[PDB]
Nucleic acid binder design. Sequence first.
RNA 1: AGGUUAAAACUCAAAUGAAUUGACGGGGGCCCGCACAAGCGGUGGAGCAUGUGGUUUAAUUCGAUGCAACGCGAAGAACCUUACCUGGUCUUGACAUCCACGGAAGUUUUCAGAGAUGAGAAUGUGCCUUCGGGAACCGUGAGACAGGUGCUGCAUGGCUGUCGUCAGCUCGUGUUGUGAAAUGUUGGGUUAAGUCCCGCAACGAGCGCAACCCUUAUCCUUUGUUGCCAGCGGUCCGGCCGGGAACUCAAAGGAGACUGCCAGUGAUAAACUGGAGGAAGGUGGGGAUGACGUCAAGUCAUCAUGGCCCUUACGACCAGGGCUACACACGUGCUACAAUGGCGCAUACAAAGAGAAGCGACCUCGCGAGAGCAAGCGGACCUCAUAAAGUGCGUCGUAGUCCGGAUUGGAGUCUGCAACUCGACUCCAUGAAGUCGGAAUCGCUAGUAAUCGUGGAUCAGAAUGCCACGGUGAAUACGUUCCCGGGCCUU
Lengths: 153, 100, 84, 206
Amino acid sequence: PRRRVIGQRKILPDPKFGSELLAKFVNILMVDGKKSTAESIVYSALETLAQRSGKSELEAFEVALENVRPTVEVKSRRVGGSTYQVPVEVRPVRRNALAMRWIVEAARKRGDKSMALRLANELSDAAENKGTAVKKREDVHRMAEANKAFAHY
Amino acid sequence: AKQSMKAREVKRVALADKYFAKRAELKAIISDVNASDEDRWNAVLKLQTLPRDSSPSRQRNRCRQTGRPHGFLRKFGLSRIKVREAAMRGEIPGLKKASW
Amino acid sequence: PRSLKKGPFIDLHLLKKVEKAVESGDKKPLRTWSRRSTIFPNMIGLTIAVHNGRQHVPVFVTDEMVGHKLGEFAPTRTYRGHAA
Amino acid sequence: GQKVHPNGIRLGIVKPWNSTWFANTKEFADNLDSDFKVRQYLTKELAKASVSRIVIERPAKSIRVTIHTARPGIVIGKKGEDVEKLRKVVADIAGVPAQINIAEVRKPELDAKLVADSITSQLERRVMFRRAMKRAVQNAMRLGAKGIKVEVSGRLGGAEIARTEWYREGRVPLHTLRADIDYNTSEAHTTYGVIGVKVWIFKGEI
RNA sequence: AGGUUAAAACUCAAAUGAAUUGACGGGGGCCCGCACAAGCGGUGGAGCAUGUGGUUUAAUUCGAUGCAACGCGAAGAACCUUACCUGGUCUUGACAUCCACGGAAGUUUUCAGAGAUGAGAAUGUGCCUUCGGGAACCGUGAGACAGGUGCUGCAUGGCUGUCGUCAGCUCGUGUUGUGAAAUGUUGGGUUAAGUCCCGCAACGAGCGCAACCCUUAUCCUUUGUUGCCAGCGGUCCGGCCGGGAACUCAAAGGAGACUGCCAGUGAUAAACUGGAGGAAGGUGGGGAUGACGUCAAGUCAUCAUGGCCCUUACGACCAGGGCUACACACGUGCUACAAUGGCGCAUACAAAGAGAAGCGACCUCGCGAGAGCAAGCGGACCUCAUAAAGUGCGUCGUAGUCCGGAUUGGAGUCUGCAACUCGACUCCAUGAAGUCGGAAUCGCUAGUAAUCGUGGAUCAGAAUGCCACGGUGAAUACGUUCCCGGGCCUU
Ligand SMILES: [K+]
Ligand SMILES: [K+]
Ligand SMILES: [K+]
Ligand SMILES: [K+]
Ligand SMILES: [K+]
Ligand SMILES: [K+]
Ligand SMILES: [K+]
Ligand SMILES: [K+]
Ligand SMILES: [K+]
Ligand SMILES: [K+]
Ligand SMILES: [K+]
Ligand SMILES: [K+]
Ligand SMILES: [K+]
Ligand SMILES: [K+]
Ligand SMILES: [Mg+2]
Ligand SMILES: [Mg+2]
Ligand SMILES: [Mg+2]
Ligand SMILES: [Mg+2]
Ligand SMILES: [Mg+2]
Ligand SMILES: [Mg+2]
Ligand SMILES: [Mg+2]
Ligand SMILES: [Mg+2]
Ligand SMILES: [Mg+2]
Ligand SMILES: [Mg+2]
Ligand SMILES: [Mg+2]
Ligand SMILES: [Mg+2]
Ligand SMILES: [Mg+2]
Ligand SMILES: [Mg+2]
Ligand SMILES: [Mg+2]
Ligand SMILES: [Mg+2]
Ligand SMILES: [Mg+2]
Ligand SMILES: [Mg+2]
Ligand SMILES: [Mg+2]
Ligand SMILES: [Mg+2]
Ligand SMILES: [Mg+2]
Ligand SMILES: [Mg+2]
Ligand SMILES: [Mg+2]
């Protein structure tokens, strides 16, 4: 906004693990305010991921987030003349938000049976650097690299 | 509203009041489950003989100061415009601008 | 439709007209404005001129018309298509 | 833009209601209609009596009408003859025993309804509207109002194009809820049509 | 190339200079707003509801009709409503006052019509009354008159939208200028604010801002039934009973929030940033509240009103029809396209409100909508009245399907004189389009969006609209370069 008067809102940690990171992931996945449904989906997918891999749910989730998190994005900047796509560094909070949003969108786009299964498959693919939201991170990085010459506007 | 339109309503009210019970007992006979199959027919035929204006369903609530047939309010007997005017003048007891 | 426990509806004037017509050989059309009357199995054969709003159209009552209202056979709106 | 009614917005804060009775939904509309008819008859009958306010109460199976007037002698008549006649007619209209009380409006120049009616009578008598409004404002200010505003709208002076003209003195703080603002309107039926008059009078904050 | 000298006819009532107030600029500077940006969910695609344009019609009544008309007047068109059409009828008249005459008013039936209505046929003939009269209410007779939703919102009052809840708009006296005008109101800061401080040819004042109002968040006192159950005593385990006044709560009166305190910054100012305490911290959240004015904006069909117009008709009554039409176009919505789901069983947790020609329990009957009988309640007591989403278990396994529920056939229920045109709801069967929607476009910054149910006005019956109530409950805002609207100074 113009006035710069927006603070921050505290978020309760998730029940099973007490991680605000996972609580934010549940919030992103939630639709129509059905938080219990979102939590059940997330927990089922996390248990499937944990039994697929050798790490805990939090460790596997962190691996997937590390593989999907972007570092530099492109934003439009209009100056005297034409608008340029300037590459800008992404702050850590936005890195996490983008990683979660891309993962959720990719899982929703997948075509498996259940949403929990789709989320588990997407998380495993992210941990192995395959599939969507990983291609999305790659596309964002490619655009930033192509527009690197404009990193002074 | 027009004077004739107001007179229609007063006539309808008068007719309904006059024929109130003579309609009620006929309707009771018609709706009686244990009634015969010919007294029901006679009651049905007799109900049509009464003037149509005696049925209470023919009445249309109208503003008691203007005759407006739309925007009626039963609690005050007036249309919305007249209710607003009286409320602002302070003539409706206990009624003020609400806010919550 | 009308409840069974109340029986089919019929206007008293039309009932009197059909009673006076069936016993006699009167084949003249029975002019009426009562489109709300159910067709009863007692006036099959004679023609009833039902009002449609601006005129009386004659319907020849047959057996298959029993149970329908008189107005069902007197259309009220004139339509011939757009730009036809 | 449009403004809220100054009396209505203050009806529960600093201003009293003009009707004080309780009823259920069964008789609320009937009571409202009878009050309307009573006020109509009283206003028509006491046209020259300088009636400013008609308060109606219904204690129990009876009607009590308080008439605020600047000419109580004209209202009452000789040994209560006129007020007795009005009591009879009011009882007949309301269908219940009637009791009429007379309240004194001292300083009629500080009463919004009376000022508006006076201006309206002058306009119907073809007095200059400017002179009428200036006189009303000056009288109220001299009597000691903290403020007054007078507004006249219509075909002033028989002009083909209607307009609105207003004068104000002192302060008339219409946005202050606790301000004692007496507001009233009147209409004049001249040969060129209807002219509306509105009067606000400020009497200090409570 | 052209220069230089240099007319006239005809034509207009101006052409022009400087300066003033605005408005405007693809001029400058500084600010604000779901205005962008960051996000979430929609519309435009489908079916249906609803309004409008058009077309059609005897009539499809009239009005609104860039933003600021299009689920708008209408908070509810089968008859009525109704203002429109066809047909049948009346003329001081459906609705008032005045005069003359006959008569109590009223009730009960017959015929004709289709009704309006006409012709009758019986029953009463009361009530003050000096029993001269009346004085209600009817009918007839004239004529002053009644009547008009007929026209002009560009003659008007009243009421409303709108820029915009934007921070603005002005006046008195003084002073400057021949004058229009200017100053104040500009400037340095600051604020949500023409908010406040400082400066200053201005000194003051008014309408606006803020506050006073309602509601919500905390606490205290009083009162304690129909509301409550902590300590007790019983108990059919049901606050059920004796009780208790603690608690939730109901509603009256108070307290509390004021940059009040601390630190830093700042012009020894206004103020800003952070901290403590507190339920709440900087306008705590929401509402009400709409300045001078603008659009000859809307409404003569709520009402009122100047003028005009009709008067055996543009007035009045009735029946039937129409306002519900349908090659099409647009706006606003509802339901979906599914598995974060459908279906079956079981099982929790709300708030707000209404009710007497009303809400209607229990029991019985019916697959069901409902029906019969019949308590209680003008209500913290009774009824409406099971909240749903949610959770547990099972199944469906990606299919135009156990998705979707449009359309149609048959059979019913209820309201209502009367469901054909044209009501709502139920049962059986039927099972359309639709698999996430082009250009384009809308709403929203927090208990919001999204999603889930509940109630109310209108109302005999007739909500997917409108108004209101709770449950669950997000994402994102780096920033002001750009789009839209606006504020201040300057050019
Ligand atoms: K020459
Ligand atoms: K010349
Ligand atoms: K769409
Ligand atoms: K408009
Ligand atoms: K107007
Ligand atoms: K000068
Ligand atoms: K001056
Ligand atoms: K007029
Ligand atoms: K109709
Ligand atoms: K809808
Ligand atoms: K739509
Ligand atoms: K199906
Ligand atoms: K119907
Ligand atoms: K400018
Ligand atoms: Mg009228
Ligand atoms: Mg009705
Ligand atoms: Mg010039
Ligand atoms: Mg955007
Ligand atoms: Mg569509
Ligand atoms: Mg129209
Ligand atoms: Mg028009
Ligand atoms: Mg709307
Ligand atoms: Mg109709
Ligand atoms: Mg206008
Ligand atoms: Mg200014
Ligand atoms: Mg100035
Ligand atoms: Mg101020
Ligand atoms: Mg100054
Ligand atoms: Mg204010
Ligand atoms: Mg206009
Ligand atoms: Mg118009
Ligand atoms: Mg009709
Ligand atoms: Mg319509
Ligand atoms: Mg299905
Ligand atoms: Mg906002
Ligand atoms: Mg209803
Ligand atoms: Mg400003």
